[PDB]
Amino acid sequence: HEVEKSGLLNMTKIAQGGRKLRKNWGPSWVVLTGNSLVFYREPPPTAPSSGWGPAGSRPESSVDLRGAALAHGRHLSSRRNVLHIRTIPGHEFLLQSDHETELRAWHRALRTVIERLV
Numbered sequence: 001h002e003v004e005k006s007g008l009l010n011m012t013k014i015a016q017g018g019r020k021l022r023k024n025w026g027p028s029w030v031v032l033t034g035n036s037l038v039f040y041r042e043p044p045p046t047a048p049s050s051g052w053g054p055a056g057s058r059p060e061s062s063v064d065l066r067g068a069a070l071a072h073g074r075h076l077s078s079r080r081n082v083l084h085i086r087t088i089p090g091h092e093f094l095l096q097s098d099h100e101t102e103l104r105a106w107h108r109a110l111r112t113v114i115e116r117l118v
């Protein structure tokens with residue numbers, strides 16, 4: 001169960017179990033594994049390229065990527081580089097970076113992960 005990609009992104013929840021939510025954008029240390037996206041309030045104390053950081057570091061949340069859906073976040077945010085993710089329990093969120101190459105890489109990595117879970 002380990003790390004395909006990790007990085008800081010801006011994130012907001014859009015819906016939880018299909019209930020719409022008021023956006024609340026903010027920075028998150030994001031960790032993509034082969035089956036999940038895990039969100040941390042902040043990045044590791046050190047060795048951030050390792051993804052998880054210390055084992056005692058607790059995540060705020062994570063989602064199951066099996067059968068998740070990806071889409072451009074244009075209709076849900078005015079932020080330039082925005083990706084919308086919807087997972088099968090009906091959680092929806094936006095990921096966003098000020099750097100399009102960063103967000104582009106996340107888009108491609110996330111897709112590949114969902115695809116390997118079919």
Ligand SMILES: O=P(O)(O)O[C@H]1[C@H](O)[C@@H](O)[C@H](OP(=O)(O)O)[C@@H](OP(=O)(O)O)[C@H]1O
Pocket residue numbers: 023024025076077078079
């Ligand atoms: O003004 P505060 O309470 O901080 O919250 C806003 C954010 O600051 C904006 O970034 C949101 O718009 P974008 O998602 O288009 O960036 C904006 O989204 P909205 O204008 O589409 O509702 C709000 O979520």
